[PDB]
């Protein structure tokens, strides 16, 4: 129960990651299209 | 880019918080082997 | 069997999000490189 | 630059599968302790 | 306990991803400062 | 970015280290149960 428990965790902490990935993959798709 | 780095901001604090969450799970969970 | 399984989906999301991390970092040093 | 946007379409459809697969089977796996 | 002790890896490499993704956003806070 | 240089080196370093350990971890987890 507790090692399901850490896979809840350890599952929410890489849906946050994606999120800031996105965020980063975003910035710089900005910045690329800006100056090439 | 302002909007962009709030963003950044709030996910960085809640996979943070997530983290120290996963720390005391991990913690508890070797402790019960021992 | 079911935990073992949820472990191969958590870490195979984490290699995933590597290649695209690393796919961020080869852009950030390409726009670096071209400007300065 | 071309590759990159064709690796990082590719991974990002990958990440977000996978991710949906985790979901799935936690829901699966919180079930079965019950 | 070979589950607990693989967990422990998951939650090491999501910490060093994290580090890592602190690193990109500087860098691309760094250019988008610069170029925009 | 020297030091930026320095230190993506070594959390990719660290990363690629942890992700081998656990699949090989994970390879004979299942092994064991099949």
Redesign the interface.
């Given at each position: 129960?507790?090692?399901?428990?850490?896979?809840?965790?350890?599952?929410?902490?890489?849906?946050?990651?994606?999120?800031?990935?996105?965020?980063?993959?975003?910035?710089?798709k900005?910045?690329?299209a800006?100056?090439? | 880019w302002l909007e962009w780095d709030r963003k950044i901001e709030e996910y960085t604090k809640k996979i943070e918080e997530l983290i120290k969450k996963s720390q005391e799970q991990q913690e508890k969970n070797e402790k019960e082997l021992k």
């Amino acid at each position: 129960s507790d090692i399901v428990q850490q896979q809840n965790n350890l599952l929410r902490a890489i849906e946050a990651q994606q999120h800031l990935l996105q965020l980063t993959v975003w910035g710089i798709k900005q910045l690329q299209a800006r100056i090439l | 880019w302002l909007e962009w780095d709030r963003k950044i901001e709030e996910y960085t604090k809640k996979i943070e918080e997530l983290i120290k969450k996963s720390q005391e799970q991990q913690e508890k969970n070797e402790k019960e082997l021992k």
